[PDB]
């Protein structure tokens, strides 16, 4: 088969990582012990993408759990589906990053990365045909941010012809009171734009605004935000996990989603938070995007949409044309037929039908401009710079990450203004 090796680093990575494994374990009908107790053969046709099959029909997640502090490790191991993960695939330090990107990337993390790579290599070598890696982490912290981007670079050195996918959670003052997060985010984006092929931009600003403004969840907990992430991560992997024709693997998705290598930052979307018409209208609405960007402030380069549940497939085709026709100005004309629609007839838990959205929109610059706005004010202040230079970092490495993100924004702007003739 075509196996994906999952990696979750830092606190955020392990939090959303564990919920991801909880949701897809139930969708594939395996219990926290690892035995299968489902009813549909479609659950097992492509199970090897995410699970290792052991003796006695025992399915073990192909997952590697990493963090510079042993705290989160006990949380996952004690939480549901904690006894399903492989004990040897737990790689935890004791020092702790403390939201220092330099610690995760150059100092503390550089000393644990090798014992992580040993686990990556052991899982990889047992793959029938490894297709690539997917990493869950945040960009505002130190481990998931700094070490997460180190692991990606290290893995790319040994597997340069494989796909590197990430679910990167973007920082927002509405969720985390830590003030230095725009430093860690900018330093990370400098790495993700160079060493990843596909990055799902999970924006805490959007997750917060959705819970607060749409779900009416004043004081939203991390459990509320991660319920959206889990439903999203389940949606954007449906094509990998169940039998399908379209974007069935990580490479075919990238070819359909990435017209230029640097422009590989997707804004996902989900619905509902029904009829096929309003399922389609919601998923293209700014309120249902998991990135705090308005798609009607830019143009779509490419779009992938998967519908889940029992529904009329004629109606899905009719309504996807309707949205593209009535919003023709918001799709670049120099890429014909850039919107692709998939349909998986096994719905998620709780919903009779849902819709997941993956857009490569030039409006994503709004997210990078937000980070740059915070970062640039902090850099002039030179506020909290000794903690980074204290680990041996230079002031230029901050400047370089800034100008690279300025280029990314201007490159997204260039192709938004581009025309066919």
């Amino acid at each position: 088969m075509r196996e994906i090796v999952h990696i979750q680093a830092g606190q955020c990575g392990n939090q959303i990582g564990a919920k991801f494994w909880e949701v897809i374990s139930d969708e594939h009908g395996i219990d926290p012990t690892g035995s299968y107790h489902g009813d549909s053969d479609l659950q097992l046709e492509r199970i090897n993408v995410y699970y290792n099959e052991a003796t006695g029909n025992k399915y073990v997640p192909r997952a590697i759990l990493v963090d510079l502090e042993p705290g989160t490790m006990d949380s996952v191991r004690s939480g549901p589906f904690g006894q399903i993960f492989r004990p040897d695939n737990f790689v935890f330090g004791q020092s702790g990053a403390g939201n220092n990107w330099a610690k995760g990337h150059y100092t503390e993390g550089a000393e644990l990365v090798d014992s992580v790579l040993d686990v990556v290599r052991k899982e990889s070598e047992s793959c029938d045909c490894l297709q690539g890696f997917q990493l869950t982490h945040s960009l505002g912290g130190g481990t998931g941010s700094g070490m997460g981007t180190l692991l990606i670079s290290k893995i790319r050195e040994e597997y340069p012809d494989r796909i590197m996918n990430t679910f990167s959670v973007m920082p927002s003052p509405k969720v985390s009171d830590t003030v230095v997060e725009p430093y860690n985010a900018t330093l990370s984006v400098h790495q993700l734009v160079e060493n990843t092929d596909e990055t799902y931009c999970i924006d805490n600003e959007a997750l917060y605004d959705i819970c607060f403004r749409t779900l009416k969840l004043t004081t939203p907990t991390y459990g509320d935000l991660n319920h959206l992430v889990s439903a999203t991560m389940s949606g954007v992997t449906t094509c990998l996990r169940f039998p399908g024709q379209l974007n069935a693997d990580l490479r075919k998705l990238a070819v359909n989603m990435v017209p230029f290598p640097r422009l590989h930052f997707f804004m996902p979307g989900f619905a509902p938070l029904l009829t096929v018409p309003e399922l389609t209208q919601q998923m293209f609405d700014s309120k249902n995007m998991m990135a705090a960007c308005d798609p009607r402030h830019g143009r779509y380069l490419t779009v992938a949409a998967i519908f889940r549940g029992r529904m009329s497939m004629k109606e899905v085709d009719e309504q996807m044309l309707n949205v593209q026709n009535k919003n023709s100005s918001y799709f670049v004309e120099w890429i014909p037929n850039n919107v692709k629609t998939a349909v998986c007839d096994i719905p998620p838990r709780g919903l009779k039908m849902s819709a997941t959205f993956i857009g490569n929109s030039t409006a994503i610059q709004e997210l990078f401009k937000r980070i740059s706005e915070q970062f640039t004010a902090m850099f002039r202040r030179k506020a909290f710079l000794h903690w980074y230079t204290g680990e041996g970092m230079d002031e230029m490495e901050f400047t370089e990450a800034e100008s690279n993100m300025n280029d990314l924004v201007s490159e997204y702007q260039q192709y938004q203004d581009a025309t066919a003739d």
Binding site: C129, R251, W334, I335, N337
Partner: protein
């Protein structure tokens, strides 16, 4: 003798192979286990169906076919399907990693790992032939294997088999069932690369087949299964002259002489009749005149184009079933005095006719009504260049911005190959224009 070896490349080729070889088996009364009670020459023979089937001592009739796909899930369905006993395991070849809708991976990165093994298995079939006629290659234009690996195979076949004839059944991309945004790139790359190595290519526009299934068969959302059973009927009509004998039977090679006036102009337009549902065929007999006139309704063509805005360079009618020349001549005489039929000035205007008395066949539970007589028209029309124009325009839109080109360069290709391929397509479009001009 005159054996033909079929090669099915990629999902479309493989899945169309299942429909074609299932349909062939039903036409010849061959069972899923390969036994053919009516065939009394056990272990061999010179019969017409032996051009496509070999025979084992145990009485099994085995398709002279190779199935190749750089991923195993499509061919696995053949290995475990109703007709798994029909094929020897060595005829079904699979890699581990597909081309990811990338011509470069199909032709180079992945294809080079398996090209030699495939050619060895094809050679193994050829050595069982007493008079190999040529190859039939089934593939999509859009997929990475169908485009990349096919063109690699066609190049290698030209080296190992010289000028032995090579025919294509090419699936032309349509957005209703498209799987990749880069299918125009793969289409132009494989067309440019195979052009010198193919003698005749029958394009099947998925949108043409999709529209016919919706309008003529009342299929709300046609699937690949609906399309492939219709495609196999057109393929079965074209190969029927090789697999059956008859007084009025005309070999496909005789049609080929008429269909290809110049080497590069080898893309005939296919038109089939009658495509009708059981519900509609009830108490409605389609006469020879009705199905023949239907061949000149653009709604019934395998490729979306308007022959009324083009010129004919050949017109072949391949009838099968209850058809007598008398009715054909009457139907043709009527059509010639009512249609927009214009031949180039350097070619005679006569229609070439073939009749196979074996009636059309349908697969159980299929959407096509079983009819007493069918016809497939093979015409060489300048209008087919419209299909090139649409593909080239979509290519130009993306290539102007170099969208997705980095996926190809990363696998070893150069921008010069894109421009070289597009320049060849521009020359081909001019070729179809020049052949349509009147003589001085």
């Amino acid at each position: 003798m005159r054996e033909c070896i079929s090669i099915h490349v990629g999902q479309a080729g493989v899945q169309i192979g299942n429909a074609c070889w299932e349909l062939y088996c039903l036409e010849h009364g061959i069972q899923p286990d390969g036994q053919m009670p009516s065939d009394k020459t056990i272990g061999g023979g010179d019969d017409s169906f032996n051009t496509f089937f070999s025979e084992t001592g145990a009485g099994k009739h085995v398709p002279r076919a190779v199935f190749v796909d750089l991923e195993p899930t499509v061919i696995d369905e053949v290995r475990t399907g109703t007709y798994r006993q029909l094929f020897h395991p060595e005829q079904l070849i699979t890699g581990k990693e597909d081309a990811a809708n990338n011509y470069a991976r199909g032709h180079y990165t992945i294809g080079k790992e398996i090209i030699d093994l495939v050619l060895d298995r094809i050679r193994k079939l050829a050595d069982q032939c007493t008079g190999l006629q040529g190859f039939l290659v089934f593939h999509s234009f859009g997929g990475g294997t169908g485009s990349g690996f096919t063109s690699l195979l066609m190049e290698r076949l030209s080296v190992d088999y010289g000028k032995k004839s090579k025919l294509e059944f090419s699936i032309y991309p349509a957005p209703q069932v498209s799987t990749a945004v880069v299918e125009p790139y793969n289409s132009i790359l494989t067309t440019h690369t195979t052009l010198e190595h193919s003698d005749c290519a029958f394009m099947v526009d998925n949108e043409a087949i999709y529209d016919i299934c919706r309008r003529n068969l009342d299929i709300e959302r046609p699937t690949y299964t609906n399309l492939n059973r219709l495609i196999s009927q057109i393929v079965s009509s074209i190969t029927a002259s090789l697999r059956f004998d008859g007084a009025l039977n005309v070999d496909l090679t005789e049609f080929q002489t008429n269909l290809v006036p110049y080497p590069r102009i080898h893309f005939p337009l296919a038109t089939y009749a009658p495509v009708i549902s059981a519900e509609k065929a009830y108490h409605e007999q389609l006469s020879v005149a009705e199905i023949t006139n239907a061949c000149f309704e653009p709604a019934n063509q395998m490729v979306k184009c308007d022959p009324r805005h083009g010129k004919y360079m050949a017109c072949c009618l391949l009838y099968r079933g209850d058809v007598v020349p008398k009715d054909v001549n009457a139907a043709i005489a009527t059509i010639k005095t009512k249609r927009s039929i214009q031949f180039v000035d350097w070619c005679p205007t006569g229609f070439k006719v073939g009749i196979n008395y074996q009636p059309p066949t349908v697969v159980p539970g299929g959407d096509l009504a079983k009819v007493q007589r069918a016809v497939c028209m093979l015409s060489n029309t300048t209008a087919i260049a419209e299909a090139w124009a649409r593909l080239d325009h979509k290519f130009d839109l993306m290539y102007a911005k170099r969208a997705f080109v980095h996926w190809y360069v990363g696998e070893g290709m150069e921008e010069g190959e894109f421009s070289e391929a597009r320049e060849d397509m521009a020359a081909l479009e001019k070729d179809y224009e020049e052949v349509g001009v009147d003589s001085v």
